[PDB]
Design a protein around this ligand. Structure first.
Ligand SMILES: [Zn+2]
Length: 269
C-alpha cells in the first residue's frame, strides 16, 4: 500500500487545483513473470507523449527482424520535415541519419523529427497501432504525428495508452520472442542511454541500479515515464507512471513522479 498511498497523494496534490479531468496512473510489473505487483488506475487512458517512441522503434525492429528494414539504412530528409524539439536531426541535414541513429535520437534524446521519420518508414501512426494490435495490445493507439499527438485534450482517446497495456507491451518488447534477441537488446540499450529523463525516476535511483526508460511531456499537464529497472545492474520490474490534466508546473510534476519513484525503490522488497 505505501507506494499506492504515495501515488494517490501525488494525484491529490497535482489535481486539487485542476478544475478539469486530472489523474495519475501507475503500474509495477514483475519483468520475468508479467505479474502485476501493484497498480493505480491501471485501465484508464493517458496520453503517451514521447513514451510512444519506444513502441515505434519496436515496430521498426520488427521490420528489421523480418528483413524489411535495415539498422544501417540511411534516410536523407528535408528541412521541411523538421519539427519542434529536434536536437539531433537538425544537425544531420547534410549527411542524413541511419535507422539506428534515428531510433537512438527518438529514444535517448526524444527527437521529434526522428520519430516522424521512423513513422514514415512504417506507414504512419495507424500502422504503429496495427503493429500493436497484432502483438496483443488492443488498447494503445497512435493517431497523430509529432507534435500534435501531445494535445492531451481532456478525455480524448487519440494517442493514448493505459498503464497496464503499456507495461505489458513494454514487457513483451523487452523480453518476449516478439522481437529477436538482437532487437530486444538494442531496444533496451536505447532506453538505458536515455539522456532526457533525469528529473524523474533516475533522480530517485540508487547507484548501481539498472534503468532503461523513456519519458514524455505534453500539453495540459501531461507527463509520464515507462521504465525497466532493478538493483545490482539488471532490470527486474517494469514501472509505468502517467499523469494528465494538472495545472501544476513542470518542476512540481517532475518532483511528484520522482517521489513515486523514491517510494517504489524504498518499498521494493
Ligand atoms: Zn485489436
Amino acid at each position: 500500500p505505501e507506494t499506492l498511498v504515495k501515488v494517490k497523494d501525488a494525484e491529490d496534490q497535482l489535481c486539487r487545483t485542476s478544475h478539469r479531468p486530472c489523474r495519475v496512473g501507475y503500474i509495477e510489473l514483475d519483468l520475468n513473470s508479467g505479474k502485476i505487483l501493484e497498480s493505480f488506475r491501471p485501465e484508464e487512458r493517458f496520453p503517451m507523449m514521447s513514451t510512444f517512441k519506444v513502441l515505434l522503434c519496436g515496430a521498426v525492429l520488427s521490420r528489421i527482424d523480418a528483413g524489411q528494414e535495415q539498422l544501417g539504412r540511411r534516410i536523407h530528409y528535408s528541412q521541411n520535415d523538421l519539427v519542434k524539439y529536434s536536437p539531433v536531426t537538425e544537425k544531420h541535414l547534410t549527411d542524413g541519419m541511419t535507422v539506428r541513429e534515428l531510433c537512438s535520437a527518438a529514444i535517448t534524446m526524444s527527437d521529434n523529427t526522428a520519430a516522424n521519420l521512423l513513422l514514415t518508414t512504417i506507414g504512419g501512426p495507424k500502422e504503429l497501432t496495427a503493429f500493436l494490435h497484432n502483438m496483443g495490445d488492443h488498447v494503445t493507439r497512435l493517431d497523430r504525428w509529432e507534435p500534435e499527438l501531445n494535445e492531451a485534450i481532456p478525455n480524448d482517446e487519440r494517442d493514448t495508452t493505459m498503464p497496464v497495456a503499456m507495461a505489458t507491451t513494454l514487457r513483451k518488447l523487452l523480453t518476449g520472442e516478439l522481437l529477436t534477441l538482437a532487437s530486444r537488446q538494442q531496444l533496451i540499450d536505447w532506453m538505458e542511454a536515455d539522456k532526457v529523463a533525469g528529473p524523474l525516476l533516475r533522480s530517485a535511483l540508487p547507484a548501481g541500479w539498472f534503468i532503461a526508460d523513456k519519458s514524455g511531456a505534453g500539453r495540459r499537464g501531461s507527463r509520464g515515464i515507462i521504465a525497466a529497472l532493478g538493483p545490482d545492474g539488471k532490470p527486474s520490474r517494469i514501472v509505468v507512471i502517467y499523469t494528465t490534466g494538472s495545472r501544476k508546473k513542470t518542476d512540481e510534476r517532475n518532483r511528484q513522479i520522482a517521489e513515486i519513484g523514491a517510494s517504489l525503490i524504498k518499498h521494493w522488497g
